[PDB]
Design a protein around this ligand. Structure first.
Ligand SMILES: *OP(=O)(O)OC[C@H]1O[C@@H](n2cnc3c(N)ncnc32)[C@H](O)[C@@H]1O
Ligand SMILES: [Mg+2]
Lengths: 62, 26, 479, 23, 51
């Protein structure tokens, strides 16, 4: 029962949140959040390549 | 697996305010 | 300078904290917090504190986050109110959801109502007939029923089934309302208000702030009542896309009301502004919150305000309320957005002095901290900055008399300012010297023309309290 | 403070017994 | 754990002797006092904070 949240340091999420907070416009904030989300999704795809039924999701970060 | 380290990789108008000095010297 | 925690570990520790709080074990909370402190950096701990307090202040709307996550995520959350389902179902951006609608045992954000200006009421109803009903003073609840299983959800989605009962064997409402439903109804979703009912007088007790309909007391005589004003699902038939007329019609074929425990709110047809004004005046006569106006051909739209539902209260109409001129006797410091300034204040009424003398003693009435812009607050702080004094509980001042609520800094009445307060009503309280406190207080104007010795007096406050049973809206709208 | 015991705080360090020391 | 001279006590041995002497003195003099022994610089760990 592998989970992506078991591989993601909390420091990465904290740094992303700090960058979002210390940004001027909506574009930059959305950009940082989107970068984090895309990295998470790509890692999810890599990790669960063989498994069939997966309950993993973005919930731990959301 | 390559690990999480690989995937993350870490108009307008002008305003002017004159400021004169009302001292005895001036 | 570096941490060693993953997201899963943090979630596990927070889960331990919550569960151990539920089980009344503080040692485990201390242990979990100690582990978090020892295995985290300063930045991580700042963000953990923000998450625990449940305020992040990212500056980006929740709607923006949902829109970035998936094209249809806010829509799904308005129907499920569960982040887990949103994140699991909407994992692949390309793959969407065919149809999203209210489902059994899934909380949905209730439909709300928008303020109405009585003049254009007809224009808001598209020049057609509309429904007028009374506004009830209680909690908002939604009930899901499947056979013998019941579930209850609050306005924001919090589960309340423990209080009201998940089965006819237990609860405060279910054992009595189970038999109200008709033979053919097994699946049902209802939306309504939860109220307190006194059987001796057979009257609804308005939950201004007291007698805890939020948590009924066993020894109390009053009981819990459910006033239903909507149906959204009956026997695998979804009614959320139907008109209000059809739902109101169907609502009479689900349960046969038994007074005191479950009821249907009465809706009256009306097609003129004068009818609305008459209903509002009648509500003021009966000492009620206000009225609601609804459009018969309006569908249900979760989490949406000002679509088909409107509300009118005496406060929204100018001039219909009594306002109180009271003094500022103390102040408090503010939170983030307004940090280095006095944001909320403690006000007091005067004591009728001997004839031909200025007032000497004062009695606290209530705190007020809303209704002033930032500039007004800055100016007020500058005016009263010199006269603030620290408050010591051991040596309270003679001029100001306080109850259980005490200010951080107090100012002598001779150097303070008069403030106008608009409040819904006056209610008994034990935290203030006057024995009463305002409901929904706000500042209407900092009067620069009134002296400190022109403040209200306990006699005037008592007269106002007794004039209209405490409600500050007494007279009738005229046109 | 001066000449205090490092084993029992609050007590003065007793000098060791010396017996008879003839002058 | 190093002895500068062949006939001399290592710092560790001196520390342990002192600890034992204080323990015996406390037993005889004040038996209701509290004493504890901790080590730092080791490879293993045993503490509440899991340091
Ligand atoms: O002021 P507000 O936004 O809380 O008002 C809306 C709330 O009013 C309550 N309420 C009482 N009676 C009704 C009817 N008949 N219809 C809709 N809402 C009603 C609800 O608690 C609602 O959230
Ligand atoms: Mg209400």
């Amino acid at each position: 029962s592998q989970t992506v949240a078991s591989h993601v340091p909390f420091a990465d999420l904290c740094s992303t949140l700090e960058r979002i907070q210390k940004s001027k416009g909506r574009a930059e904030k959305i950009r940082h959040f989107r970068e984090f989300l895309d990295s998470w999704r790509k890692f999810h795809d890599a990790l669960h390549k063989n498994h069939k039924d997966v309950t993993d999701s973005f919930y731990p970060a959301m | 697996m390559s690990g999480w380290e690989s995937y993350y990789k870490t108009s307008g108008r002008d305003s002017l305010i004159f400021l004169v000095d009302a001292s005895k010297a001036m | 300078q570096k941490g060693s925690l993953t997201i899963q570990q943090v979630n596990d520790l927070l889960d331990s904290i919550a569960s151990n709080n539920s089980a009344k074990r503080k040692d485990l909370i201390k242990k979990s917090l100690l582990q978090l402190i020892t295995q985290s950096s300063a930045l991580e701990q700042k963000w953990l504190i923000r998450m625990i307090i449940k305020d992040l202040k990212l500056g980006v709307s929740q709607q923006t986050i949902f829109s970035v996550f998936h094209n249809d995520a806010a829509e799904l959350h308005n129907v499920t109110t569960d982040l887990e389902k949103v994140c699991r179902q909407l994992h692949d951006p390309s793959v969407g959801l065919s149809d999203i609608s209210i489902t059994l045992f899934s909380a949905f954000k209730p439909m709300l109502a928008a303020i109405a200006d009585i003049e254009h009421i007809e224009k808001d109803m598209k020049h057609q007939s509309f429904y007028i009903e009374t506004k009830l003073d209680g909690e908002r609840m939604q009930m899901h029923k499947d056979g013998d299983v019941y579930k209850y959800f609050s306005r924001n989605g919090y589960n309340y089934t423990d209080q009201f009962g998940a089965s006819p064997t237990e609860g405060s409402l279910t054992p009595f309302i189970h038999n109200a439903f008709k033979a053919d109804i097994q699946i049902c979703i209802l939306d309504g208000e939860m109220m307190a009912y006194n059987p001796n007088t057979q009257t609804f007790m308005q939950k201004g702030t007291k007698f805890d309909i939020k948590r009924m007391v066993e020894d109390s005589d009053l009981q819990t009542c459910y006033c239903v004003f909507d149906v959204l699902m009956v026997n695998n038939k979804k009614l959320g896309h139907e008109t209000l007329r059809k739902r109101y019609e169907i609502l009479s074929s689900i349960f046969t009301p038994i007074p005191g425990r479950i009821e249907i709110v009465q809706k009256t047809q009306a097609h003129t502004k004068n009818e609305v004004i008459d209903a509002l005046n009648e509500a003021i006569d009966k000492r009620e919150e206000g009225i609601m106006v609804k459009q018969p051909l309006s569908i249900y739209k979760p989490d949406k305000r000002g679509e088909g539902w409107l509300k009118i209260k005496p406060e929204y109409v100018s001039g219909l309320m009594d306002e109180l001129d009271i003094l500022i006797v103390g102040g408090y410091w503010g939170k983030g957005s307004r940090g280095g300034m006095m944001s909320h204040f403690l006000c007091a009424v005067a004591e009728k002095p001997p004839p031909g003398e200025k007032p000497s003693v004062f009695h606290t009435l209530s705190r007020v901290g809303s209704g002033c812009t930032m500039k007004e607050l800055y100016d007020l702080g500058l005016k009263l900055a010199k006269y603030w004094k620290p408050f010591h509980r051991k040596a309270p001042p003679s001029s100001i008399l306080c109850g259980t609520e005490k200010p951080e800094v107090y100012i002598e009445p001779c150097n303070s300012v008069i403030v106008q307060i608009k409040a819904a009503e006056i209610v008994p309280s034990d935290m203030y010297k006057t024995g009463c406190t305002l409901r929904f207080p706000r500042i209407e104007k900092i009067r620069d023309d009134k002296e400190w010795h022109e403040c209200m007096t306990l006699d005037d406050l008592e007269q106002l309290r007794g004039k209209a049973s405490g409600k500050l809206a007494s007279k009738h709208l005229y046109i | 403070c001066p000449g205090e015991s490092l084993i029992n705080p609050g007590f003065k360090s007793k000098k060791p017994a010396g017996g008879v020391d003839f002058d | 754990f190093e002895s500068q001279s062949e006939d001399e006590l290592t710092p560790f041995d001196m520390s342990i002797q002192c600890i034992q002497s204080v323990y015996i003195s406390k037993i005889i003099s004040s038996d209701r006092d509290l004493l504890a022994v901790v080590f730092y610089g080791t490879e293993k760990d045993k503490n509440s904070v899991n340091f």
